[PDB]
Each structure stands twice: as C-alpha cells, then as structure tokens.
Amino acid sequence: MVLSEGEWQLVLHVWAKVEADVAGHGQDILIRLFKSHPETLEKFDRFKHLKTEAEMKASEDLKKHGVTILTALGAILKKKGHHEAELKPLAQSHATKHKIPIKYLEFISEAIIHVLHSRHPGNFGADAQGAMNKALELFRKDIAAKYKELGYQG
Ligand code: HEM
Numbered sequence: 001m002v003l004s005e006g007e008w009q010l011v012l013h014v015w016a017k018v019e020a021d022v023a024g025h026g027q028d029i030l031i032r033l034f035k036s037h038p039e040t041l042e043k044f045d046r047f048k049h050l051k052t053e054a055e056m057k058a059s060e061d062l063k064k065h066g067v068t069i070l071t072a073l074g075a076i077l078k079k080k081g082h083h084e085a086e087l088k089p090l091a092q093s094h095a096t097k098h099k100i101p102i103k104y105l106e107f108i109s110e111a112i113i114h115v116l117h118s119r120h121p122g123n124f125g126a127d128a129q130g131a132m133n134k135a136l137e138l139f140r141k142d143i144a145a146k147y148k149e150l151g152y153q154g
Pocket residue numbers: 040041043044045046068069070072073089090093094098100104105108
C-alpha cells in the first residue's frame with residue numbers, strides 16, 4: 001500500500017504531539033494493551049508478574065520499554081514508507097527471539113489508536129485516524145512479509 005503525502009501529514013502531525021510526552025504515551029499504550037489483551041503480557045518475561053494496573057503504572061521498567069517501543073515506531077513512521085532498513089532487525093528479533101504473532105501487532109495497533117483518540121481528540125478526527133490506521137496496517141503488512149522470509153509463520 002501507499003499512503004499519500006496528505007495522509008502522512010496527518011500521521012506526523014499527531015505524532016509530533018505524542019513526542020511532547022513519549023514516556024507518558026508509551027506507558028498508556030502498554031497498559032491499554034495488557035488490560036485489553038492480557039495474553040500479550042505473557043510474552044514479556046520481564047513484566048509477567050505485574051498483576052494490577054497500579055503495579056503497571058508504578059513500574060519504571062515498563063515505562064522505559066514503552067519509550068523504546070515509541071522511539072522505534074516513530075523512526076519508522078518518519079521514513080514515510082521507506083522503512084525497509086529499520087524494519088529488518090525489528091522483524092528478526094520479534095519473529096525469532098520474542099516470537100510475536102502478527103495478531104499481537106494488531107492488538108498494539110489498536111491500543112495506539114485508542115490512546116491517541118483519548119489524548120488528542122482535536123488532532124485525531126476520523127481522517128487522521130484513518131491515516132494512522134493505514135500507516136500501521138502498512139507497518140504490519142511489511143513486517144508480516146519479512147516474518148515469512150525469516151521463516152516465522154503459521
Ligand atoms: C509497534 C510495535 C512494536 C515495536 C515498534 C516494538 C519494538 C521493540 C523494540 C525496539 C524492542 C528492543 C529491541 C528488540 O528486542 O528488538 C522490543 C523488544 C521486545 N518486544 Fe517489541 N515492539 C513492538 C511490538 C511488540 C509486541 C506487540 C510484543 C508482545 C505481545 C512485543 C514484545 C517484545 C518483547 C518480549 C521484547 C523484549 C523485551 C525485554 O525483555 O527487554 N513487541 N520491542
């Protein structure tokens with residue numbers, strides 16, 4: 001798929017708001033993911049024990065990782081589709097070391113859209129949401145194709 005420039009603008013205009021507080025957004029997102037789809041919590045041997053949302057909010061580690069996720073995603077979005085290089089190492093560690101099913105990349109895509117909608121209603125109307133959705137679908141389709149090349153499937 002190809003996003004137009006007007007779609008990329010809508011995605012990079014709400015991402016610039018997310019970058020004013022990356023640690024807060026990365027925390028909200030991960031918690032939204034772990035409450036909605038608790039099975040995803042099992043993939044993190046590092047956070048697995050966290051039992052409540054309050055524990056999650058207090059974990060500094062969890063907040064550090066949220067910043068790692070959003071920094072890597074932001075670097076991919078800012079490429080505006082030319083992200084092949086960035087994708088490579090990310091597809092290799094998530095398909096071979098962490099074993100993360102595409103299904104779980106959809107679940108986090110859903111958590112990102114829920115959090116931007118709650119924090120940025122004015123910059124995240126229907127057109128901007130459609131554009132963000134298109135950009136994450138593009139990210140998931142390219143990762144899925146690398147997963148096949150790398151041998152991960154089902
Ligand atoms: C927007 C999507 C995502 C991005 C941009 C992302 C990115 C990252 C980055 C940059 C790291 C550090 C380096 C590495 O191991 O590759 C990482 C590690 C990891 N990721 Fe992801 N991730 C994403 C989605 C997920 C999802 C959905 C799961 C789980 C359901 C997942 C599970 C993990 C695990 C288990 C680790 C190792 C964490 C730790 O032990 O240090 N990732 N991820």
